[PDB]
Each structure stands twice: as structure tokens, then as C-alpha cells.
PDB file of C-alpha atoms in Angstrom:
ATOM      1  CA  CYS A   1      -2.886   0.869  -5.118  1.00 19.20           C
ATOM      2  CA  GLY A   2      -3.226  -2.846  -5.735  1.00 17.77           C
ATOM      3  CA  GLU A   3       0.023  -3.568  -3.936  1.00 17.79           C
ATOM      4  CA  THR A   4       0.801  -5.171  -0.600  1.00 18.61           C
ATOM      5  CA  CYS A   5       3.524  -4.003   1.746  1.00 17.85           C
ATOM      6  CA  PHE A   6       4.156  -7.174   3.736  1.00 14.45           C
ATOM      7  CA  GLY A   7       7.670  -5.898   4.320  1.00 17.47           C
ATOM      8  CA  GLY A   8       6.486  -2.335   4.761  1.00 16.16           C
ATOM      9  CA  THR A   9       7.416  -1.353   1.237  1.00 17.01           C
ATOM     10  CA  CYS A  10       5.632  -0.607  -2.040  1.00 18.05           C
ATOM     11  CA  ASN A  11       6.778   0.094  -5.586  1.00 16.91           C
ATOM     12  CA  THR A  12       3.699   2.135  -6.443  1.00 13.78           C
ATOM     13  CA  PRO A  13       4.453   5.785  -5.524  1.00 14.81           C
ATOM     14  CA  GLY A  14       2.187   7.772  -3.236  1.00 16.08           C
ATOM     15  CA  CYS A  15       0.870   4.715  -1.449  1.00 15.09           C
ATOM     16  CA  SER A  16       0.675   4.652   2.331  1.00 17.44           C
ATOM     17  CA  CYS A  17       1.648   1.262   3.701  1.00 15.13           C
ATOM     18  CA  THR A  18      -1.459   0.269   5.604  1.00 17.79           C
ATOM     19  CA  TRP A  19       0.221  -2.994   6.605  1.00 15.30           C
ATOM     20  CA  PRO A  20      -0.008  -5.259   4.928  1.00 12.84           C
ATOM     21  CA  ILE A  21      -1.686  -3.351   2.056  1.00 15.13           C
ATOM     22  CA  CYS A  22      -0.708  -0.002   0.538  1.00 16.89           C
ATOM     23  CA  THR A  23      -3.482   2.561   0.282  1.00 18.19           C
ATOM     24  CA  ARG A  24      -3.800   5.689  -1.824  1.00 16.49           C
ATOM     25  CA  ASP A  25      -4.799   8.078   0.944  1.00 13.31           C
ATOM     26  CA  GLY A  26      -6.797   5.423   2.765  1.00 14.45           C
ATOM     27  CA  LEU A  27      -8.082   3.724  -0.383  1.00 15.59           C
ATOM     28  CA  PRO A  28      -6.482   0.312  -1.115  1.00 14.32           C
ATOM     29  CA  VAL A  29      -6.657   1.166  -4.824  1.00 18.30           C
TER      30      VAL A  29
END
């Protein structure tokens, strides 16, 4: 997803906040 969710939030849709990095179904892409 290429986005971090330090505050448990991400702009990129469909990204699971795998604190502190959002993953696209497990993949931090």
C-alpha cells in the first residue's frame, strides 16, 4: 500500500492497518 497508519488510519482504500503500516491483504504494498 506504501502508506503507514501510525494513527491507525490510511488514505489508500482497501488497506488493512497492520500498525504501523497498511497492508493490502497482508502485503505492505
